Design a protein that fits this description.
Chain lengths: 50, 77, 63, 252, 91, 112
RNA sequence: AUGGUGAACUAUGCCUGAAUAGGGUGAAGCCAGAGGAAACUCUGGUGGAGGCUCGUAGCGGUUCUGACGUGCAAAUCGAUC
RNA sequence: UUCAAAUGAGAACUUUGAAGACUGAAGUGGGGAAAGGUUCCACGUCAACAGCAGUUGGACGUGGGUUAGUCGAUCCUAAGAGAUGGGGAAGCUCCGUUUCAAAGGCCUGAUUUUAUGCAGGCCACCAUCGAAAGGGAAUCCGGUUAAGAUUCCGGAACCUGGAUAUGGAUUCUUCACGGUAACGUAACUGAAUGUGGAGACGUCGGCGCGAGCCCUGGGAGGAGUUAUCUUUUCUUCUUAACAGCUUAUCACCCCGGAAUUGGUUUAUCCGGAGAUGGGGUCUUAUGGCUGGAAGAGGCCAGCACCUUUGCUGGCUCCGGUGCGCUUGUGACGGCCCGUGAAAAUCCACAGGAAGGAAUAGUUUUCAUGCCAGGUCGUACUGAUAACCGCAGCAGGUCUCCAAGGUGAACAGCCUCUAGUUGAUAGAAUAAUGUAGAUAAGGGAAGUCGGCAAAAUAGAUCCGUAACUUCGGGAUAAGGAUUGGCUCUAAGGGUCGGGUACGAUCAACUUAGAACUGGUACGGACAAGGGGAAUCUGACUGUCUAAUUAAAACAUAGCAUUGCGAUGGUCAGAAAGUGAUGUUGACGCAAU
């Protein structure tokens, strides 16, 4: 770390973006079933394994 | 980066095509041990060197300043 | 203040001393000091003609 | 049980030689036209330490007979040879220390080093610090020449085997007690991973023919047969006698 | 002021290894370190430089020699033998 | 009192990571990294530094005028004068002694 | 049994780097001096040797069979070493 | 740990102020390597989470933030990895790496159908991957952000590639002069081929020098103390890369010709193979002066006004000290059966193919001038909460910088700078505990056993047995002494002397003598118990991570065995396979 391949930078980038809460307007959709974001990740409870 | 002393050689720089800007600086200093005197530095920005010419003589200073090319962009102080 | 009373020689008796005499000041430093002095007094006394080269070259090795 | 130590050596894992610092291979000149019809002059340019070797090497440079340039060879230095010396290699060359000559052209009693087993193998016999070989005969028909190797064995080779007059330098190296473990240590550190040596008798049976027992002991003759098989041959392999050697050796 | 009755340089090893090995070492040490005569420029300035390498302070020649002494008994006798056998070839 | 940090990511004391402390116009201490020292070119024959020649890290010699890279004499910035003196004598004498060898053996041949 | 995955721990070798307060001892070499008929023997200095020694950091892990023993901890903590 | 304020529905726990402490530069400081990956920063914010709390957070919501020709990568090669003509193998694939291979490409010439065929001459180097600590082209200061900075802004440089003209240099003696020489210089053509050097190299020791830090006088500011005392205590006073001149131990040259041997290092090395002496040449580490550059930065004072915030002044000066400390470097010296990488890349030289002037040629290794410099990383943490240990775990995890006193000291103990003041809290102080201490008289009677604990300890001086491999044993054992204050004496530098001394400056060391005290004084800290034997391993070293550290293993030493290569020992299913082997009996292998 602290001097990364672009490969790794990329992945970390993608990761940041998946780290939002459920966009609440999905909740309103007909037949919506997704309550919250069940795949949320947090830097000190689960490590990325790269 | 460069110092200069031939008051002739200097003048020749000041008309050296790429010499657009130049600058004259003034310093209070002291003479020998007793009193002070007005020192002036003649800086010319060549394309890769800043030549400066220290005229320690207030007299030769003034006469040198009207020697300056009328087309040069002299910065005063 | 203290540091003054040192170059006045105070606070320096046997009870104020924990490094061995040699730690406090090496023997060899003493020597090099002393030898270098004799060595060069000889040179001036030679340069000056006060002493002649034959006497100087014995005093040297004798130093 | 386990694969014993002397069987793991063959795969050369941790067991290869420690090579990084060695000067290069020590070899005589390629037996070309100059050396087998006349002689050719060189200059030892340097005599120098080879890591993990007893005896110093001698960098000796020659002229290329075929191109304008200097081709440098690495010799094992004979005692006496020196920086600046001129070295002569060839059939028709002269008999002084340092030169290299086919065993044919040296009278018996001549004493030479780095000798070839066949002509041109660029040097094979007596290279170790101290060692040499003495010519003891000639048989001009089928030009063979007989010599006594360092071991004691006598052998015969082509009279076109090249040798170099003199003994190998740095002799006597083995008279100085190593004194401590660390010197053997630094010794083998530039050779190979063969030191220290656990005795097989201090091992467990999986480890060795010698392992185990409530006291330490070989428990069977330690003279193993030639016909024995890997994993069996530790001890006195094919020993034709055994015990303290009494009275002068020296082959007859 | 005679500093040691017998160990000399071998004094460094203290009590270790046992007199005899120490005596054997002392001998070869004294040879190996000692300053030698240079056959070439005639000054005593040949000191050792890793076993069998003997090279001259002033004048800068290097000679392959014995592991702890310049010339080795063997070397020399061989040098004499080679003398003699060579002579046979011109006369 | 004032201490100092490295100025590059490498945190170790390698030969290529020497540091020198320095006083800036800001009135504080700052590290400055320092190139390894250049060694002196050596004489190809005898071995000394050869005098007359500048000392630069090897690629810096292409940023310097050719007079910094030689002395005038034959084998200028390559061999050490005394060494050239020597090889000249040797060259002359050997070539002379060479002629001696030839007329002497020409004599042998017609007087034998 | 068959086919696979491990040397991020650790063991060993190789390559390339880095790290180690302050003390005690005083080996070769060297200088000057003294005795003695002689052979030779003595003294004072200099010098700075060692898998040397006191002891931090380091590396280790001896005893308390100390703490803890549903722990800080699936091996740790303290003192002493 | 404490008081108060502010905030807030709510405050032991947030923010601010005050106070009391701590880490004590071997840091609880300032940064990095691996690893994490947004934790960084702002704003909002408390449902869960931070084993009390919570208005706070590395949590939660929403956003913002990581700027390079010069820093790294990228290139190089190391151990090693691994395609290829091949050889094995039913085959997945195994072996081979320059190997039993028809292995490939540069300089220009020949073109003036034309774009590039042939003409020479070479060179036979045979992939490639493998270092963010090895090798390596080149940047610095100041300023700036909520969060980036050797990356932005400012100024001032440098390297590499490409183009190029002007000036200077050089030539009618074509390819410069000068110097006796070491060699000098702004230049001062040079193909193939060859050679040389740099890259490029152990470790310890003392000695010499540099830099930064430390200590210190004077002066010009600002701050603190002032019942009393102190011309006082504290602090500011700085100068980057880069460039011109100058500067060095070593080394070398010229003159000279040496015993009465001289010169000379702390360390005994040097001289007829030319010393001592006198005169010069060189490297430019390093430093000095100037340019950069005072216009910056630092410290003050005097006005201005809600504001952005200005504005005007000054001063930023001269010195001293050294067994100091850290680091750098030099010439030396000890050591070795240890002698302590490679390659890219750069330059030089030997060579002389060639091309070149007087009506005008040659020259870009001299100066100046023009253009350009891609891609990816750059935030932060680096740990008693940003990494690994199920976790904000007393564990583990590579490194640089390093102030004052006491002291031998990077020890311990106290401090400055910086950083903390985190660890649920309140009230009591029963038993039994854990950790820290003391105890009359006796003194191991306790106990398997002196386990634990106590005793000893620094230094200076005196004194020191058996025995021994003569090196030790040895701090053997055994003794005395030690504060404070006031004196004394000894130990150095620098200068002029025609071809005996004087004058000044700057340092703690060592010994001696008075006086002095509730006989105390290494006053805390720090800091060996000693002796006589028996058993056993020679020693230093090694191991059972996590019940065994030992007498076990190792080791030097000793002895035996096998082997001359068509070989010994060992590897492999096999092979044009492999280890020892870059080897050769002073060797490898096996006990
Ligand atoms: Mg001494
Ligand atoms: Mg000194
Ligand atoms: Mg002196
Ligand atoms: Mg003398
Ligand atoms: Mg098996
Ligand atoms: Mg190998
Ligand atoms: Mg081993
Ligand atoms: Mg054994
Ligand atoms: Mg063994
Ligand atoms: Mg066992
Ligand atoms: Mg068995
Ligand atoms: Mg059996
Ligand atoms: Mg058994
Ligand atoms: Mg037995
Ligand atoms: Mg200060
Ligand atoms: Mg950094
Ligand atoms: Mg030159
Ligand atoms: Mg020069
Ligand atoms: Mg020429
Ligand atoms: Mg590992
Ligand atoms: Mg030390
Ligand atoms: Mg001590
Ligand atoms: Mg020590
Ligand atoms: Mg007498
Ligand atoms: Mg020592
Ligand atoms: Mg030790
Ligand atoms: Mg010890
Ligand atoms: Mg101590
Ligand atoms: Mg520890
Ligand atoms: Mg250990
Ligand atoms: Mg413990
Ligand atoms: Mg216990
Ligand atoms: Mg319990
Ligand atoms: Mg300890
Ligand atoms: Mg609290
Ligand atoms: Mg404190
Ligand atoms: Mg400390
Ligand atoms: Mg903390
Ligand atoms: Mg950081
Ligand atoms: Mg992380
Ligand atoms: Mg934050
Ligand atoms: Mg809540
Ligand atoms: Mg949490
Ligand atoms: Mg909670
Ligand atoms: Mg709560
Ligand atoms: Mg967030
Ligand atoms: Mg965000
Ligand atoms: Mg770079
Ligand atoms: Mg690239
Ligand atoms: Mg392969
Ligand atoms: Mg690569
Ligand atoms: Mg690299
Ligand atoms: Mg590197
Ligand atoms: Mg910004
Ligand atoms: Mg920052
Ligand atoms: Mg900045
Ligand atoms: Mg800029
Ligand atoms: Mg600019
Ligand atoms: Mg260019
Ligand atoms: Mg000229
Ligand atoms: Mg080359
Ligand atoms: Mg080289
Ligand atoms: Mg290297
Ligand atoms: Mg620079
Ligand atoms: Mg001189
Ligand atoms: Mg002269
Ligand atoms: Mg250091
Ligand atoms: Mg060496
Ligand atoms: Mg060069
Ligand atoms: Mg031609
Ligand atoms: Mg140019
Ligand atoms: Mg490109
Ligand atoms: Mg950063
Ligand atoms: Mg933290
Ligand atoms: Mg974790
Ligand atoms: Mg996990
Ligand atoms: Mg932890
Ligand atoms: Mg902190
Ligand atoms: Mg707790
Ligand atoms: Mg009692
Ligand atoms: Mg008693
Ligand atoms: Mg009893
Ligand atoms: Mg009793
Ligand atoms: Mg009882
Ligand atoms: Mg018992
Ligand atoms: Mg009993
Ligand atoms: Mg005890
Ligand atoms: Mg008591
Ligand atoms: Mg005994
Ligand atoms: Mg005793
Ligand atoms: Mg007293
Ligand atoms: Mg005095
Ligand atoms: Mg033992
Ligand atoms: Mg031990
Ligand atoms: Mg165990
Ligand atoms: Mg087990
Ligand atoms: Mg033990
Ligand atoms: Mg244990
Ligand atoms: Mg024995
Ligand atoms: Mg085959
Ligand atoms: Zn010589």
């Amino acid at each position: 770390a602290a001097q990364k391949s672009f490969r790794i930078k990329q992945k970390m980038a993608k990761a940041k973006k998946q780290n939002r809460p459920l966009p609440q307007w999905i909740r309103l959709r007909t037949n919506n079933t997704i309550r919250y974001n069940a795949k949320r990740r947090n830097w000190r409870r689960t490590k990325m394994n790269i | 980066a460069r110092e200069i002393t031939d008051i002739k050689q200097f003048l020749e720089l000041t008309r050296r095509a790429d010499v657009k800007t130049a600058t004259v600086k003034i310093n209070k200093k002291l003479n020998k041990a007793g009193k002070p005197f007005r020192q002036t530095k003649f800086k010319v920005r060549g394309s890769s060197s800043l030549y400066t010419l220290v005229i320690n003589d207030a007299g030769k200073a003034k006469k040198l300043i009207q020697s300056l090319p009328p087309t040069l962009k002299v910065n005063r102080l | 203040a203290h540091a003054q009373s040192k170059r006045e020689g105070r606070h320096s008796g046997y009870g104020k001393r924990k490094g061995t005499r040699e730690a406090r000041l090496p023997s060899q430093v003493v020597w090099i000091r002393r030898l270098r002095v004799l060595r060069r007094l000889l040179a001036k006394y030679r340069d000056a003609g006060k002493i002649d080269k034959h006497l100087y070259h014995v005093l040297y090795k004798e130093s | 049980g386990r694969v014993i130590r002397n069987q793991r050596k063959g795969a050369g894992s941790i067991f290869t030689s420690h090579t990084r610092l060695r000067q290069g291979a020590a070899k005589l000149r390629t037996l070309d036209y100059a050396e087998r019809h006349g002689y050719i002059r060189g200059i030892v340019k340097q005599i120098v330490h080879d890591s993990g070797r007893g005896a110093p090497l001698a960098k000796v440079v020659f002229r290329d007979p075929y191109k304008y340039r200097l081709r440098e060879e690495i010799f094992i230095a004979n005692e006496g040879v020196h920086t600046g010396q001129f070295i002569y290699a060839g059939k028709k060359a002269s008999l002084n220390v340092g030169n290299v000559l086919p065993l044919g052209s040296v009278p018996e009693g001549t004493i030479v080093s780095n000798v070839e087993e066949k002509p041109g193998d660029r040097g094979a016999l007596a290279r170790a610090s101290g060692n040499y070989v003495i010519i003891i005969g000639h048989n001009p028909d089928e030009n063979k020449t007989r010599v006594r190797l360092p071991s004691g064995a006598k052998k015969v080779i082509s009279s076109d085997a090249r040798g170099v007059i003199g003994v190998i330098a740095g002799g006597g190296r083995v008279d100085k007690p190593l004194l401590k473990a660390g010197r053997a240590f630094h010794k083998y550190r530039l050779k190979r991973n063969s030191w220290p040596k656990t005795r097989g008798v201090a091992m467990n049976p999986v480890d060795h023919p010698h392992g185990g027992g409530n006291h330490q002991h070989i428990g069977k003759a330690s003279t193993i047969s030639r016909g024995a098989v890997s994993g069996q041959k530790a001890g006195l392999i094919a020993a034709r006698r055994t015990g303290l050697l009494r009275g002068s050796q020296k082959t007859q | 002021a005679k500093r040691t009755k017998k160990v000399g340089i071998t004094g460094k090893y203290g009590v270790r290894y046992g007199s005899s090995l120490r005596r054997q070492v002392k001998k070869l040490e004294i040879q190996q370190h000692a300053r030698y005569d240079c056959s070439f420029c005639g000054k005593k300035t040949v000191k050792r430089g890793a076993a069998g390498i003997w090279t001259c302070s002033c004048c800068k020649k290097t000679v392959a020699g014995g592991a702890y002494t310049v010339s080795t008994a063997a070397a020399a006798t061989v040098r004499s033998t080679i003398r003699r056998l060579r002579e046979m070839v011109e006369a | 009192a004032q201490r100092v940090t490295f100025r590059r990511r490498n945190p170790y004391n390698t030969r290529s990571n020497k540091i020198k402390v320095v006083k800036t116009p800001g009135g504080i201490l700052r590290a400055q990294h320092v190139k390894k020292l250049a060694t002196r070119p050596k004489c190809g024959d005898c071995g000394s530094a050869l005098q007359g020649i500048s000392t630069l890290r090897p690629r810096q010699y292409a940023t310097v005028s050719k007079t910094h890279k030689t002395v005038s004499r034959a084998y200028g910035g390559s061999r050490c004068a005394n060494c050239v003196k020597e090889r000249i004598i040797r060259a002359f004498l050997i070539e002379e002694q060479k002629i001696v060898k030839k007329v002497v053996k020409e004599q042998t041949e017609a007087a034998k």
